[PDB]
Write an enzyme that holds these catalytic residues in place. Structure first.
Site, PDB file in Angstrom:
ATOM      1  N   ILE A   1      -0.089  -1.546  -3.138  1.00  0.00           N
ATOM      2  CA  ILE A   1      -1.260  -1.895  -2.330  1.00  0.00           C
ATOM      3  C   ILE A   1      -1.745  -0.674  -1.546  1.00  0.00           C
ATOM      4  CG2 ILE A   1      -0.895  -4.389  -2.233  1.00  0.00           C
ATOM      5  CD1 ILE A   1       0.249  -3.861   0.718  1.00  0.00           C
TER       6      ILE A   1
ATOM      7  N   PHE B   1       4.568  -4.265   7.479  1.00  0.00           N
ATOM      8  CA  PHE B   1       5.743  -3.806   6.737  1.00  0.00           C
ATOM      9  C   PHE B   1       6.508  -2.803   7.575  1.00  0.00           C
ATOM     10  CE2 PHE B   1       3.073  -5.053   3.099  1.00  0.00           C
ATOM     11  CZ  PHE B   1       3.995  -5.554   2.165  1.00  0.00           C
TER      12      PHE B   1
HETATM   13  C1  LIG Z   1       8.508  -4.859 -13.566  1.00  0.00           C
HETATM   14  C2  LIG Z   1       7.953  -5.821 -12.852  1.00  0.00           C
HETATM   15  C3  LIG Z   1       6.676  -5.539 -12.088  1.00  0.00           C
HETATM   16  C4  LIG Z   1       6.963  -4.839 -10.750  1.00  0.00           C
HETATM   17  C5  LIG Z   1       7.503  -5.776  -9.684  1.00  0.00           C
HETATM   18  C6  LIG Z   1       8.687  -5.575  -9.059  1.00  0.00           C
HETATM   19  C7  LIG Z   1       9.584  -4.406  -9.401  1.00  0.00           C
HETATM   20  C8  LIG Z   1       9.106  -6.513  -7.951  1.00  0.00           C
HETATM   21  C9  LIG Z   1       8.516  -5.910  -6.649  1.00  0.00           C
HETATM   22  C10 LIG Z   1       9.444  -4.934  -5.909  1.00  0.00           C
HETATM   23  C11 LIG Z   1       8.033  -6.955  -5.657  1.00  0.00           C
HETATM   24  C12 LIG Z   1       6.917  -7.886  -6.156  1.00  0.00           C
HETATM   25  O1  LIG Z   1       5.900  -7.201  -6.918  1.00  0.00           O
HETATM   26  C13 LIG Z   1       5.401  -7.900  -8.081  1.00  0.00           C
HETATM   27  C14 LIG Z   1       6.401  -8.627  -4.924  1.00  0.00           C
HETATM   28  O2  LIG Z   1       6.164  -7.710  -3.815  1.00  0.00           O
HETATM   29  C15 LIG Z   1       5.735  -8.305  -2.575  1.00  0.00           C
HETATM   30  O3  LIG Z   1       6.723  -9.213  -2.075  1.00  0.00           O
HETATM   31  C16 LIG Z   1       5.589  -7.200  -1.528  1.00  0.00           C
HETATM   32  O4  LIG Z   1       6.315  -7.182  -0.529  1.00  0.00           O
HETATM   33  C17 LIG Z   1       4.555  -6.163  -1.698  1.00  0.00           C
HETATM   34  O5  LIG Z   1       3.378  -6.467  -1.446  1.00  0.00           O
HETATM   35  N1  LIG Z   1       4.910  -4.928  -2.099  1.00  0.00           N
HETATM   36  C18 LIG Z   1       6.292  -4.480  -2.490  1.00  0.00           C
HETATM   37  C19 LIG Z   1       6.664  -3.230  -1.683  1.00  0.00           C
HETATM   38  C20 LIG Z   1       5.613  -2.120  -1.834  1.00  0.00           C
HETATM   39  C21 LIG Z   1       4.265  -2.640  -1.348  1.00  0.00           C
HETATM   40  C22 LIG Z   1       3.833  -3.894  -2.110  1.00  0.00           C
HETATM   41  C23 LIG Z   1       3.340  -3.493  -3.462  1.00  0.00           C
HETATM   42  O6  LIG Z   1       2.257  -2.912  -3.595  1.00  0.00           O
HETATM   43  O7  LIG Z   1       4.169  -3.842  -4.587  1.00  0.00           O
HETATM   44  C24 LIG Z   1       3.766  -3.433  -5.888  1.00  0.00           C
HETATM   45  C25 LIG Z   1       2.657  -4.340  -6.372  1.00  0.00           C
HETATM   46  C26 LIG Z   1       2.914  -5.830  -6.430  1.00  0.00           C
HETATM   47  C27 LIG Z   1       1.469  -3.776  -6.689  1.00  0.00           C
HETATM   48  C28 LIG Z   1       0.244  -4.519  -7.187  1.00  0.00           C
HETATM   49  C29 LIG Z   1      -0.237  -3.859  -8.494  1.00  0.00           C
HETATM   50  C30 LIG Z   1      -1.593  -4.411  -8.992  1.00  0.00           C
HETATM   51  C31 LIG Z   1      -2.646  -4.469  -7.870  1.00  0.00           C
HETATM   52  O8  LIG Z   1      -3.794  -5.164  -8.355  1.00  0.00           O
HETATM   53  C32 LIG Z   1      -2.162  -5.169  -6.597  1.00  0.00           C
HETATM   54  O9  LIG Z   1      -3.206  -5.090  -5.603  1.00  0.00           O
HETATM   55  C33 LIG Z   1      -3.491  -6.305  -4.900  1.00  0.00           C
HETATM   56  C34 LIG Z   1      -0.848  -4.523  -6.100  1.00  0.00           C
HETATM   57  C35 LIG Z   1       5.028  -3.398  -6.775  1.00  0.00           C
HETATM   58  C36 LIG Z   1       6.154  -2.586  -6.119  1.00  0.00           C
HETATM   59  C37 LIG Z   1       4.716  -2.912  -8.190  1.00  0.00           C
HETATM   60  O10 LIG Z   1       4.320  -1.530  -8.190  1.00  0.00           O
HETATM   61  C38 LIG Z   1       5.922  -3.063  -9.123  1.00  0.00           C
HETATM   62  C39 LIG Z   1       5.742  -4.150 -10.165  1.00  0.00           C
HETATM   63  O11 LIG Z   1       4.605  -4.438 -10.499  1.00  0.00           O
HETATM   64  C40 LIG Z   1       4.431  -9.084  -2.867  1.00  0.00           C
HETATM   65  C41 LIG Z   1       3.825  -9.741  -1.642  1.00  0.00           C
HETATM   66  C42 LIG Z   1       4.624 -10.139  -3.958  1.00  0.00           C
HETATM   67  C43 LIG Z   1       5.218  -9.550  -5.236  1.00  0.00           C
HETATM   68  O12 LIG Z   1       5.698 -10.581  -6.134  1.00  0.00           O
HETATM   69  C44 LIG Z   1       4.655 -11.247  -6.868  1.00  0.00           C
END
Ligand SMILES: C=CC[C@@H]1/C=C(\C)C[C@H](C)C[C@H](OC)[C@H]2O[C@@](O)(C(=O)C(=O)N3CCCC[C@H]3C(=O)O[C@H](/C(C)=C/[C@@H]3CC[C@@H](O)[C@H](OC)C3)[C@H](C)[C@@H](O)CC1=O)[C@H](C)C[C@@H]2OC
Length: 120
Positions: free
Chosen positions: A64, A108
């Site tokens: 994000i 965070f």
């Molecule tokens: C291999 C599997 C996939 C792989 C997933 C994992 C390893 C599991 C991962 C640790 C946690 C989950 O991630 C899925 C989970 O994390 C949250 O709990 C969270 O605390 C969060 O917000 N975090 C995680 C810590 C960094 C900031 C942020 C993030 O930006 O995380 C990133 C994220 C989600 C980015 C999107 C990308 C697309 C954009 O469109 C969107 O923009 C709106 C933002 C994560 C790190 C990705 O880079 C990595 C992945 O994709 C979400 C509240 C809900 C979400 O579960 C659903």
């Protein structure tokens, strides 16, 4: 501003991630009402030699917006509290699986543990 940062523990004031580097982070995410929606800090009897920090390439849209922007301002070792406006987090959609509502300001705690200089 679209996020604020308060430093909870100073880093080394020397090593700052650049776009393209890989960063290694511990975090806890909360809603403004105090609900913890996520943490990668393991509380089971696991800790060191089991749990790994979150790794991602910084400054390229893998996280994000609030994180991508804030991390570039943090030094290695730094622990900071980030308050991220909804437009730089999940915006109007929220995130249903994590129970993040629409229009949610996210807090965070992020500790930047290490940087791999992948920008080279
Ligand atoms: C291999 C599997 C996939 C792989 C997933 C994992 C390893 C599991 C991962 C640790 C946690 C989950 O991630 C899925 C989970 O994390 C949250 O709990 C969270 O605390 C969060 O917000 N975090 C995680 C810590 C960094 C900031 C942020 C993030 O930006 O995380 C990133 C994220 C989600 C980015 C999107 C990308 C697309 C954009 O469109 C969107 O923009 C709106 C933002 C994560 C790190 C990705 O880079 C990595 C992945 O994709 C979400 C509240 C809900 C979400 O579960 C659903």
């Amino acid at each position: 501003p679209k996020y604020t940062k308060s430093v909870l523990k100073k880093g080394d004031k020397t090593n700052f991630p650049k776009k393209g580097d890989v960063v290694h982070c511990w975090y806890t995410g909360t809603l403004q009402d105090g609900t913890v929606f996520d943490t990668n800090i393991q509380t089971s009897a696991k800790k060191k030699k089991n749990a790994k920090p979150l790794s991602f390439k910084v400054g390229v849209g893998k996280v994000i917006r609030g994180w991508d922007e804030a991390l570039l301002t943090m030094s290695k070792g730094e622990k900071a509290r980030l308050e991220i406006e909804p437009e730089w987090a999940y915006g109007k959609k929220g995130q249903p699986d994590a129970k993040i509502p629409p229009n949610a300001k996210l807090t965070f705690e992020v500790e930047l543990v290490d940087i791999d200089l992948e920008h080279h």
